[PDB]
């Protein structure tokens with residue numbers, strides 16, 4: 412995954428966050444801070460990636476005003492002749508790690524985390540965005 | 546799917562039960578200032594919290610589960 | 612106050628008004644202030660005392676004929692005030708710093724004294 416960052420001068424590869432057949436996720440440093448980059452390797456160039464890029468740009472415009480919603484801020488169709496890349500802000504912790512990282516979330520923190528999840532869904536629905544992978 | 550409510554309905558149904566009222570009235574509105582696009586440096590955040598300290602204690606503790 | 616209105620440490624001789632029968636108070640603002648700022652009632656003695664000192668240091672224009680009369684007037688004011696205001700004045704002098712014969716002033720400064728919109732960082 413790090414090899415794909417060699418072509419993006421504004422992003423400096425930092426660490427690999429995961430590899431799957433669908434998306435390879437890695438963390439990179441950018442002038443704005445840390446960013447998570449999911450790289451989709453284009454195996455068949457005949458895939459209508461432009462249609463998906465337009466859908467992602469629509470998602471960015473629809474979710475730009477949501478405070479608890481983080482859409483993909485950048486979608487690059489031909490970032491490299493080999494792969495299309497999606498860029499978004501890096502957050503310190505994912506919920507999967509946060510549960511096991513101290514301080515352990517208290518009952519009041521657990522209620523607060525649940526409350527914010529619901530608020531994120533409410534805001535996304537009113538903003539016209541559905542997650543599909545919650 | 547017909548049994549799933551809308552996101553706003555769950556927040557209303559659990560308002561005061563699973564989520565204490567303090568989350569909606571102050572925690573969500575106050576905290577939203579820190580997640581805004583306008584970056585508050587760590588120094589600025591401390592000063593903002595210091596300035597509001599009296600209001601935060603009044604809003605969280607009341608005059609007095611607080 | 613150790614730092615002046617402009618953050619400069621006090622220098623030279625300073626006459627501080629002593630409040631009778633009370634311990635020196637350290638709260639901010641002090642209840643027993645030694646240097647009555649210009650915001651309060653301008654004590655003609657305090658204003659004239661500052662002027663006499665400003666004259667001594669050579670910060671006021673010397674007019675020989677005026678001085679003999681003016682200073683004689685100040686002497687009368689100070690004599691009259693000493694009779695009615697029985698307040699004591701304690702003199703304190705702060706040290707001065709010199710290097711290569713030049714005087715240096717200590718100004719309050721913090722050791723660490725020397726992007727609002729992000730495109731990607733929300």
Ligand SMILES: Nc1nc2c(ncn2[C@@H]2O[C@H](COP(=O)(O)OP(=O)(O)OP(=O)(O)O)[C@@H](O)[C@H]2O)c(=O)[nH]1
Pocket residue numbers: 428429434436447500501502503504505506507508544545
């Ligand atoms: N601490 C931390 N973990 C992250 C960050 N970004 C992603 N991760 C985690 O690293 C892994 C990346 O895989 P994902 O593709 O996001 O997994 P997923 O959320 O189940 O799949 P999607 O629904 O497509 O997002 C997951 O465990 C994420 O929680 C981050 O910025 N900080």
